[PDB]
């Protein structure tokens, strides 16, 4: 019972974006939406964007989006390591265990986590300051279009559940710590951790969503689906670095990506 709240509390501090806020905003002005290249350039120009993007100058709309995407990943991955630390008994794990879980984990956790800002119409950007059309993301020249859509497809089915922030935190913690990941020093401590974290979900679902008694099976399924998406994501990212002269990968992202697929 203590474990569950501790994850919720840890999750709340670490992540700027939570489900309530994304849903709520969607309040003097609505988040500026980008449905077009023209709109993107103007959105790109504005003071907030300039402040928070690292001042990217690439000259390719598709290239800038892919680089702009990266700020979110680095930002999320950094937050994920902190979340992992908060989880009881994660601190214990050996550096090979902690790092290995994170490298596989960070992208799986994000995709489930990404959903809350996501909408069938669009996804929130710049801490909710901006909205980008799903159509517009899909329009971008290959292979840049491919990355956003399946994540959205997963997002549509995943959103439907539907999970409070407490639910996610438990889900996320489970994703982060997996016995299966390659090269783990100890299988038993992670597996023991998973059981604890996963058990909490079971107790949690019964009080929280009495209306759905089957949530855990469906929720568990998502991890298998998520695993494929990271594989699919990884393969795509690899394409860009080889195919495109222009695209650039953050040092942290390279370490995570390398050896993952």
């Amino acid at each position: 019972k203590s474990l569950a709240k501790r994850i919720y509390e840890a999750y709340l501090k670490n992540f700027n974006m939570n489900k309530v806020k994304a849903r709520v905003i969607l309040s003097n002005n609505p988040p500026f939406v980008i449905h077009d290249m023209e709109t993107l350039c103007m959105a790109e120009k504005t003071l907030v964007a300039k402040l928070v993007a690292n001042g990217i100058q690439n000259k390719e709309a598709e290239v800038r989006i892919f680089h702009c995407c990266q700020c979110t990943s680095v930002e999320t991955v950094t937050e994920l390591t902190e979340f992992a630390k908060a989880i009881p008994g994660f601190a214990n794990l050996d550096l090979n265990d902690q790092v290995t879980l994170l490298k596989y984990g960070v992208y799986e956790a994000i995709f489930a986590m990404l959903s809350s800002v996501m909408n069938k119409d669009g996804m929130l950007v710049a801490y909710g300051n901006g909205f980008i059309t799903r159509e517009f993301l899909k329009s971008l020249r290959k292979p840049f279009c491919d990355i956003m859509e399946p994540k959205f497809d997963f997002a549509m089915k995943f959103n439907a559940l539907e999970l409070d922030d407490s639910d996610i935190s438990l889900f996320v913690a489970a994703i982060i710590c997996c016995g299966d990941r390659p090269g783990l020093l100890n299988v038993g401590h992670i597996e023991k951790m998973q059981e604890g974290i996963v058990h909490v979900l079971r107790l949690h679902l019964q009080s929280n969503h009495p209306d759905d008694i089957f949530l855990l099976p469906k929720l568990l399924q998502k991890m298998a689906d998520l695993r494929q998406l990271v594989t699919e994501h990884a393969q795509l990212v690899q394409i860009i670095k080889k195919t495109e002269s222009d695209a650039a990968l953050h040092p942290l992202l390279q370490e995570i990506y390398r050896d993952m697929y």
Binding site: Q98, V99, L102, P251, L252, E255, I256
Partner: peptide
């Protein structure tokens, strides 16, 4: 092999 990640945890 994972400089950034080791640094992140240790700080």
């Amino acid at each position: 092999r994972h400089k950034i990640l080791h640094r992140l945890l240790q700080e």
